[PDB]
Amino acid sequence: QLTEEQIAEFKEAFSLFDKDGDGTITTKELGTVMRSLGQNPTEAELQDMINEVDADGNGTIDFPEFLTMMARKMKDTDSEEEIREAFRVFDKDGNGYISAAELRHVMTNLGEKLTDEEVDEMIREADIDGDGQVNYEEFVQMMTAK
């Protein structure tokens, strides 16, 4: 079940999308965050994304709606679709490898400014085969490793 800490973590995600902190995520706000992740959804695509979480159909996502969806996806521990989605967030050029620059770009837009050493450390730890980049197999491990 949801713990106080878990709700706080989910709130950290919610806050990233709810830019003006008015308690609801709008089409406009989602567009902004999506673009910051390297995506470029149309108005229709954004509305569809909101629709999947907007249980009462008022056109926006509130915290309870967000929590319900996030909690549901977390209980499905065997799911890999969200990991694949995260990989696509990083892999901007679609070459199947996350470069140090690609890792840094996402972290920067998530509000985490990292030094070159920090970025290289993150890559090194996940880079099992040592080729300097993180492939999908390595990514699954860095996203699920305890």
Binding site: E9, F10, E12, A13, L16, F17, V33, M34, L37, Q39, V53, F66, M69, M70, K73, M74, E82, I83, E85, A86, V89, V106, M107, L110, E112, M122, E125, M142, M143, A145
Partner: peptide
């Protein structure tokens, strides 16, 4: 990308840990 974002933030929390 709501959950994917959380997974990345979760990863960062882990990185900061040990």
């Amino acid at each position: 990308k709501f959950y994917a974002t959380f997974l990345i933030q979760e990863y960062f929390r882990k990185f900061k840990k040990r």
